[PDB]
Scaffold this active site. Structure first.
Site, PDB file in Angstrom:
ATOM      1  N   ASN A  48       0.804  -1.214   0.000  1.00 17.66           N
ATOM      2  CA  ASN A  48       0.000   0.000   0.000  1.00 17.66           C
ATOM      3  C   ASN A  48       0.843   1.272   0.000  1.00 17.66           C
ATOM      4  OD1 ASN A  48       0.869   0.165   2.676  1.00 17.66           O
ATOM      5  ND2 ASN A  48      -1.061  -0.650   3.492  1.00 17.66           N
ATOM      6  N   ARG A  64       2.792   8.293  11.403  1.00 12.31           N
ATOM      7  CA  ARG A  64       2.256   7.885  12.730  1.00 12.31           C
ATOM      8  C   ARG A  64       1.824   9.132  13.510  1.00 12.31           C
ATOM      9  NH1 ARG A  64       3.274   1.936  14.598  1.00 12.31           N
ATOM     10  NH2 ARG A  64       2.933   3.036  16.546  1.00 12.31           N
ATOM     11  N   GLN A 104      -4.942   5.460  18.797  1.00 14.29           N
ATOM     12  CA  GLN A 104      -5.840   4.927  17.792  1.00 14.29           C
ATOM     13  C   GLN A 104      -6.594   3.747  18.375  1.00 14.29           C
ATOM     14  OE1 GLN A 104      -3.762   6.144  13.595  1.00 14.29           O
ATOM     15  NE2 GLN A 104      -4.299   3.962  13.820  1.00 14.29           N
ATOM     16  N   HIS A 138      -7.837   6.071  10.120  1.00 12.43           N
ATOM     17  CA  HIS A 138      -6.636   5.405   9.610  1.00 12.43           C
ATOM     18  C   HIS A 138      -7.024   4.442   8.492  1.00 12.43           C
ATOM     19  CE1 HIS A 138      -2.813   2.829  10.431  1.00 12.43           C
ATOM     20  NE2 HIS A 138      -2.667   3.633   9.390  1.00 12.43           N
TER      21      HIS A 138
HETATM   22  N1  LIG Z   1      -1.821   3.789   6.055  1.00 16.14           N
HETATM   23  C1  LIG Z   1      -0.704   4.591   6.530  1.00 16.14           C
HETATM   24  O1  LIG Z   1      -0.860   5.670   7.039  1.00 16.14           O
HETATM   25  C2  LIG Z   1       0.631   3.885   6.301  1.00 16.14           C
HETATM   26  C3  LIG Z   1       0.528   2.835   5.404  1.00 16.14           C
HETATM   27  C4  LIG Z   1       1.642   2.092   5.086  1.00 16.14           C
HETATM   28  C5  LIG Z   1       2.828   2.412   5.712  1.00 16.14           C
HETATM   29  N2  LIG Z   1       2.929   3.414   6.567  1.00 16.14           N
HETATM   30  C6  LIG Z   1       4.248   3.582   7.150  1.00 16.14           C
HETATM   31  O2  LIG Z   1       5.223   3.670   6.288  1.00 16.14           O
HETATM   32  C7  LIG Z   1       6.362   4.269   7.106  1.00 16.14           C
HETATM   33  C8  LIG Z   1       7.041   5.288   6.393  1.00 16.14           C
HETATM   34  O3  LIG Z   1       6.768   5.077   5.006  1.00 16.14           O
HETATM   35  P1  LIG Z   1       7.549   3.844   4.171  1.00 16.14           P
HETATM   36  O4  LIG Z   1       7.912   4.332   2.787  1.00 16.14           O
HETATM   37  O5  LIG Z   1       6.690   2.600   4.013  1.00 16.14           O
HETATM   38  O6  LIG Z   1       8.952   3.467   4.996  1.00 16.14           O
HETATM   39  P2  LIG Z   1      10.315   2.897   4.235  1.00 16.14           P
HETATM   40  O7  LIG Z   1       9.957   2.492   2.813  1.00 16.14           O
HETATM   41  O8  LIG Z   1      10.827   1.703   5.003  1.00 16.14           O
HETATM   42  O9  LIG Z   1      11.498   4.072   4.190  1.00 16.14           O
HETATM   43  C9  LIG Z   1      11.452   5.302   4.903  1.00 16.14           C
HETATM   44  C10 LIG Z   1      12.716   5.364   5.706  1.00 16.14           C
HETATM   45  O10 LIG Z   1      13.004   6.719   6.518  1.00 16.14           O
HETATM   46  C11 LIG Z   1      13.916   6.122   7.245  1.00 16.14           C
HETATM   47  N3  LIG Z   1      14.391   6.845   8.428  1.00 16.14           N
HETATM   48  C12 LIG Z   1      14.198   6.203   9.569  1.00 16.14           C
HETATM   49  C13 LIG Z   1      14.575   6.772  10.773  1.00 16.14           C
HETATM   50  C14 LIG Z   1      15.153   8.028  10.731  1.00 16.14           C
HETATM   51  N4  LIG Z   1      15.566   8.649  11.979  1.00 16.14           N
HETATM   52  N5  LIG Z   1      15.317   8.647   9.566  1.00 16.14           N
HETATM   53  C15 LIG Z   1      14.936   8.062   8.431  1.00 16.14           C
HETATM   54  O11 LIG Z   1      15.104   8.648   7.411  1.00 16.14           O
HETATM   55  C16 LIG Z   1      14.906   5.523   6.146  1.00 16.14           C
HETATM   56  O12 LIG Z   1      15.805   6.419   5.682  1.00 16.14           O
HETATM   57  C17 LIG Z   1      13.905   5.133   5.057  1.00 16.14           C
HETATM   58  O13 LIG Z   1      14.075   5.952   3.834  1.00 16.14           O
HETATM   59  C18 LIG Z   1       5.612   4.775   8.405  1.00 16.14           C
HETATM   60  O14 LIG Z   1       6.221   6.035   8.952  1.00 16.14           O
HETATM   61  C19 LIG Z   1       4.450   4.966   7.977  1.00 16.14           C
HETATM   62  O15 LIG Z   1       4.342   6.030   6.948  1.00 16.14           O
HETATM   63  C20 LIG Z   1       1.865   4.157   6.902  1.00 16.14           C
END
Ligand SMILES: NC(=O)c1ccc[n+]([C@H]2O[C@@H](COP(=O)(O)OP(=O)(O)OC[C@@H]3O[C@H](n4ccc(N)nc4=O)[C@H](O)[C@@H]3O)[C@@H](O)[C@H]2O)c1
Ligand SMILES: NC(=O)c1ccc[n+]([C@H]2O[C@@H](COP(=O)(O)OP(=O)(O)OC[C@@H]3O[C@H](n4ccc(N)nc4=O)[C@H](O)[C@@H]3O)[C@@H](O)[C@H]2O)c1
Lengths: 374, 381
Positions: free
Chosen positions: A146, A284, A313, A332
């Protein structure tokens, strides 16, 4: 084996007998090449409500015809929940981050048969990873299912806040007209500075969709992007989040919530945002101090806040984000459109099929396996 | 000279004392290279409410300090309106398509002094062009000033309908949670087929904004785009409107309203749409038979309808599009964001400066001049 699956409640008007459309768009792979889930078969039609109790993620016939039992409930909270009293001998646990069955250390200790904790969705912050590591529990998720869904939600909310969509729609809905009341708070997005606090799967998909709006794109991240990606999207890199805030008209949070990110948006750090900034937060709820955001909108420092995540939540009936000025909240839901449900319900089955047949679960789905992070 | 200017009402709580921000993003040109308006000066701060009576498009000090008369009113309708009473000796008439002061043949006949009819915005259908040509009245508008503004409104509305934003936000505002109720009507936009019924200034900017959403892009138009534009956006061309509807999940109307286009969306042509299609219409309200759309949404034939244009306008309080299922309506506002007003107020001043100083008005601003259809006006034929 016994599969315990926690899903959210059916619509209040009952499980749908009919849907708005007959099918879903054909999609082959995610950005980057990872293919959509590949189970052996599915017992649902893509587009049906699968994440509610009556939808059962389309698993019942598959499980029961192989000698497994499926228990589905929405009662997950506290020690008195159906989830907890059913957990003690469950082989597999499934829940979605939109209605999550928390696997605390104490709960995992009660779960004597637990072999697989499956996230029908993305992101197992509801599972204690050390306890899974120690107990040789496999933790898996339907990676990428998603990401695009959220990125659409984000850009939709950015446009809606900047253009004052929601109050404007109210004027039309209640019988008014009131052009000046609609537009005294309405701007174009074009050429505004927009920054994302992370550029992972969601953040990068947000940046790409924002590009033809002719905004100026900024981002920060623990790991900087490929210079070719920075070049193709005209990204301005910022070393820290605090370096990015004061030059952004719009800031979107797509970063995980952990210790250095809790309440990163608070009364002090909001003073660094430009007057009239917009914040979208689908990450979040606790990335933002609940009342500092409300104060910032009440005092006219922020011109809008929107997101689908809350703390706690489900949001209590009186949660201030529901009614604060210029909010664009939803419950959500961004990652559980019918489209996204079809993907992670197919992925849920694919993972179960692998787990029961002894075949390896895709590397990208794995979070914990064989007693360590994978 | 006497300038007669029609604007819409101030807000209900009065003319705003403060704004959400201090300035507007710097923009150099429109897509295609046409530069933003270039008055010698402006007597306003970009971002202020300029299209309401108290905003006066920021013209009073420029006009009055040059010996001119500025009359600003919101009473535009009928022969006893302020507008018609002041018309008889006005040299210049200015209004916005958002609250337009009609220059009928009879009114242009009464306007004994009328020399320039200025549209503060885009769309001069409220001015009778033949009567202007005969009377050597110059008709001009501030070309491109809000094309992007509308295009943003469209994609915002497409996303909101498809993802079921408005009902979901209602659940949040009213104290509920109700995930399954939000998402029983919520889909992703990705890979849907989306088509526009014209690919002009708004329609093409919509196409470009939709592209990185990985939708499949379709369009029709009286004159097809450059093959290079078709190639870089992966466009599927349709020769007729009726060919395009059945293969699209989303159809956005960006075509002008005239007789061959009136009620082009009706009970009969809606039968050509996929069950659960979405329509966005920021173009003109009467492109759609009001009740055919309302019927299509009660029956689930369409899964959402959204736009800012209505018929009649202002929409009567009981207009069915206000409350019909799965609507995303706003009042008629998409082209009068504060950002768009700043451009069209600056363009208006730029045109007046040219008109009064004897220098030529930009060709792209011209619709009628020197007794013939001109500039942008001659281009649309
Ligand atoms: N329904 C919703 O509301 C929903 C639905 C699906 C998924 N989510 C979740 O998805 C996550 C962020 O989105 P994500 O794209 O799925 O996460 P990710 O692909 O693993 O990579 C991003 C990372 O950022 C990192 N990082 C880490 C720690 C730091 N101190 N600095 C960083 O920078 C690192 O660098 C990397 O780039 C959640 O917060 C939330 O949004 C929410
Ligand atoms: N605030 C608002 O709600 C708002 C604000 C500003 C402007 N508008 C307007 O904008 C127009 C859309 O037009 P435009 O986008 O501004 O630019 P344009 O000159 O019109 O190009 C389109 C053309 O399509 C053509 N054509 C023509 C006739 C025909 N029978 N077939 C054709 O195909 C021809 O081919 C050409 O490409 C209005 O309807 C309305 O939406 C609305």
């Amino acid at each position: 084996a016994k599969v315990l699956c926690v899903l959210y409640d059916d619509p209040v008007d009952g499980y749908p007998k009919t849907y708005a459309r007959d099918d879903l768009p054909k999609i082959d792979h995610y950005p980057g090449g990872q293919t959509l889930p590949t189970p052996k078969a599915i017992d649902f039609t893509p587009g049906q409500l699968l994440g509610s109790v009556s939808g059962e993620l389309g698993l019942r016939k598959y499980l029961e015809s192989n000698g497994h039992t499926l228990v589905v409930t929405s009662d997950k909270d506290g020690p008195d929940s159906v989830f907890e009293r059913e957990l003690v001998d469950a082989d597999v646990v499934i829940s979605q981050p939109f209605w999550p069955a928390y696997l605390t250390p104490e709960r995992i200790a009660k779960a004597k048969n637990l072999k697989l904790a499956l996230t029908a969705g993305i992101g197992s912050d509801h599972v204690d990873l050390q306890s899974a590591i120690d107990r040789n529990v496999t933790v898996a998720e339907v990676t990428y299912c998603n990401s695009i869904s959220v990125a659409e939600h984000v850009v939709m909310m950015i446009l809606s806040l900047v253009r004052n969509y929601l109050p404007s729609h109210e004027w039309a809905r209640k019988g008014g007209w009131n052009i000046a009341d609609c537009v005294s708070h309405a701007y174009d997005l074009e050429a505004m500075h927009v920054g994302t606090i992370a550029a992972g799967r969601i953040g990068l998909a947000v940046l790409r969709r924002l590009a033809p709006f002719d905004v100026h794109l900024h981002y920060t991240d623990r790991h900087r992007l490929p210079e070719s990606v920075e070049k193709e999207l005209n990204l301005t890199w910022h070393a820290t989040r605090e370096d990015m805030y004061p030059v952004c008209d719009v800031v979107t949070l797509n970063i995980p919530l952990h210790s250095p990110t809790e309440h990163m948006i608070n009364d002090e750090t909001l003073k660094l945002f430009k007057r009239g900034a917009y914040i979208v937060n689908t990450a979040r709820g606790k990335l933002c101090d609940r009342d500092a955001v409300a104060r910032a909108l009440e005092s006219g420092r922020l011109a809008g806040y929107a997101g689908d995540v809350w703390f706690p939540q489900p949001a209590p009936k009186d949660h201030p984000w529901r009614t604060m000025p210029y909010n664009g909240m939803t419950p959500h839901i961004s990652g559980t459109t019918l489209t996204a449900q079809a993907r992670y319900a197919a992925g849920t089955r694919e993972i179960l099929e692998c787990f029961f047949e002894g075949r390896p679960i895709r590397d990208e789905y794995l979070i914990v396996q064989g007693g360590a992070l994978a």
